[PDB]
RNA sequence: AGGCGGCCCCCUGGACGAAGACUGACGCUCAGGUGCGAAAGCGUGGGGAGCAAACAGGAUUAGAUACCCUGGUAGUCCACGCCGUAAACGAUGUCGACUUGGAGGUUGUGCCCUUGAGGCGUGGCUUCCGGAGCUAACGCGUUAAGUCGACCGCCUGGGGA
C-alpha cells in the first residue's frame, strides 16, 4: 500500500499544513497515491483479485469523495480532480 | 523504521567467516541509517538430527534497526550464501537486547 | 549363519494378520514371518495367539544366525503387536526400551470413508 | 516456543519419535503452542527437533 | 524408531511397553485415515460429531 | 459473510482499552443500481501422491447394473473466466431506546501493600441457569422469542408446480 512516510507526504500538501489529514485531498491523494500502487501490484499478479476487492474500494471511495467534493466547493473541487487527474 | 530479529547460522565448518561475515552486515545496516541493537555469537550448537547431513551447528543472531530493503537486501546475501542456511525474521515491537 | 548377536524383529501387526520381520542393523532383513502365514485363515488370522504363534514361527529361523540381541519394531493396532512380542518373550530375549514408530501425517492424504456396510 | 533456537525446552513439546506432543497435555498458552510449530516445521531445515530415530 | 535390547531384561517386561509405545497415536488407527477416500465435510462434521460427543 | 489454522516479509483490512482536540445533525434506511460471493463442473495452459465418478474385475442374492473386495476415468494441486447456486441456520431483516436475575470464559484496562497466583472498577464479545413476560406450546427469556422509534423484505388451503 503506502508507507507512513509516504502517508505523511499526502496530508501536508493536500491539507492545511501537515495537520489537515481530514481534508479529502489527503485521503484522495492518499487514495490516489494508493490506486496507482496497487495498480502496480495489480499490474503484476492479476491474481490478487480479492485484494483487488481492496482495489475497487479505493476507486469507488475515490469517486465518493470527489463527488462529495463537488457539492461543497467546486472552486476547491475542480482543483483536485484535475489534481488527482481522473474524468474526461 | 521497523525493527527486525535476524538469526542465522554459519555451518561449524564455516565457523571462521563469522567475524568476516557479520562486519559486512555491520556495514550493511550502518549504511542504511540503521544500527545494531544486539549481536551475539552463541557459537557452535548441537542439532538433534541432520539437515540432510551432520548434527550440531554454529549459531549467530543479530537485531537490526534498518529499512526493509537492507532487511530485504540482507536476505539476498543469505539465499546465495550456502554457508548461511537459514535466517528468518520475527517481529519489531520496539528493539531490545537481553536474556540468553 | 555368520553370527550377529544383534538382530531386528520388525513387527507388522495388521488388522487381519500380524507379520514380524527379522533384520540386521543396516536394515538388511534376515528373517520374517506372519501370523496369517502360520495356520489361521480369514477370521482366525487376526487373533493374538495367532500373532503369538506367528512369533513362534518368526522367532525361529532367525537365531540360526546366532542372534543374541534384537531391537523391536512396534506397528499399529490389531491382534498382534502384543501376543507376538509375548511369544518372543518365551525364548529368553533382552530388550532395553520400546519407541513409537508411527508416521504421523501432518494433514496429508484425504481421509477414508467409513465402510457403508 | 518464543524462538526456534532453544530446542532444549522445545523438546518437552515433542514425543521421542519427533511428532510434536499436543500442547493440551503440555498446556501452555493457546498462542504459545503455535510459536512451537513455527520453530519446528520451518526450522526443521535448521535441524531443531529430530524427525525420529530411523537412520 | 530404535527399540533396544538391554542386559538381563526379559522380553516380557517391555511387552507392556511395546503396545504402550505406539498406542499414543496408533500406527494402524491413523492408517485408518488413508485406507479409503473421505470428503472433508466428513471430518468437519467428524469434528462436529466428535465435538458434540466431547461435551460431558 | 461465505469462508479463515504448519513457518517467515509487503501490503490490507477490519476490530476493541485510557485521556486530550477537532466539526457540528454532516444521521438510518434503499426501489433501481453497484461488488463480493461455500461446494461441484466446465472452458482454456500446466501439473500431477491420494486416490475416487463413470467405467472393468471378483463376491451375496431368486435375483444385487449396490452394499462386501481389486482396479479404475474424470477431478481434486499452479494461471485466466463462466457459471453465482446450497440445511450460505441461531430455520432469529436492518438500525436506535428501556428492563429482575443467576452463574462462568475470554479479551483491554485503573484500582489494591499483587503484602501472593489475589481484592476492588471501568469496556467488548461470548458460555451455561433463569424473574418477568410471552408464546399453540415447544421454550425464549438483558445478545429477548418482555416494553418502544425508521426503512426495507414477504404469505394468503392441498396437489398440479
Curated annotation (Swiss-Prot), chain B:
Keywords for this protein: Acetylation, Ribonucleoprotein, Ribosomal protein, RNA-binding, rRNA-binding
GO biological process, one term: cytoplasmic translation
Gene Ontology CC terms, in alphabetical order: cytoplasm; cytosol; cytosolic small ribosomal subunit
GO MF: mRNA 5'-UTR binding; small ribosomal subunit rRNA binding; structural constituent of ribosome
Sites of N6-acetyllysine modification: 93
Annotated TM spans: none
PTM field: 5 different forms of the protein, varying only in the number of C-terminal glutamate residues, were isolated. The sequence shown is form bS6-6, which is the longest. The first two Glu are encoded by the rpsF gene, the other Glu are added post-translationally by the RimK enzyme.
Function: Binds together with bS18 to 16S ribosomal RNA.
Record family assignment: Belongs to the bacterial ribosomal protein bS6 family.
Subunit structure: Part of the 30S ribosomal subunit. Interacts weakly with uL2 in one of the 3.5 A resolved structures.
Protein name: Small ribosomal subunit protein bS6
Residue window of the full protein shown: 1 to 100 of 135
From Swiss-Prot, chain C:
PROSITE patterns xrefs: RIBOSOMAL_S11
InterPro entries from the UniProt entry: Ribosomal_uS11 (IPR001971), Ribosomal_uS11_bac-type (IPR019981), Ribosomal_uS11_CS (IPR018102), Ribosomal_uS11_sf (IPR036967)
UniProt xrefs under Pfam families: Ribosomal_S11
Single GO MF descriptor: structural constituent of ribosome
Gene3D superfamilies (UniProt xref): Ribosomal protein S11
UniProt-listed GO biological process terms: cytoplasmic translation; translation
GO cellular component, one term: cytosolic small ribosomal subunit
Iron-sulfur among keywords: no
UniProt keyword terms in alphabetical order: Methylation, Ribonucleoprotein, Ribosomal protein, RNA-binding, rRNA-binding
Domain of life, source organism: Bacteria
More info: Has been predicted to contact the N-terminal domain of IF-3 based on footprint studies; exactly how IF-3 interacts with the 30S subunit is controversial.
Assembly and binders: Part of the 30S ribosomal subunit. Interacts with proteins uS7 and bS18. Cross-links to IF-3. In stalled ribosomes contacts ribosome rescue factor SmrB.
Family: Belongs to the universal ribosomal protein uS11 family.
Task performed by this protein: Located on the platform of the 30S subunit, it bridges several disparate RNA helices of the 16S rRNA. Forms part of the Shine-Dalgarno cleft in the 70S ribosome.
PANTHER family: 40S RIBOSOMAL PROTEIN S14/30S RIBOSOMAL PROTEIN S11
Family annotation (HAMAP family): Ribosomal_uS11 (MF_01310)
Protein name as catalogued: Small ribosomal subunit protein uS11
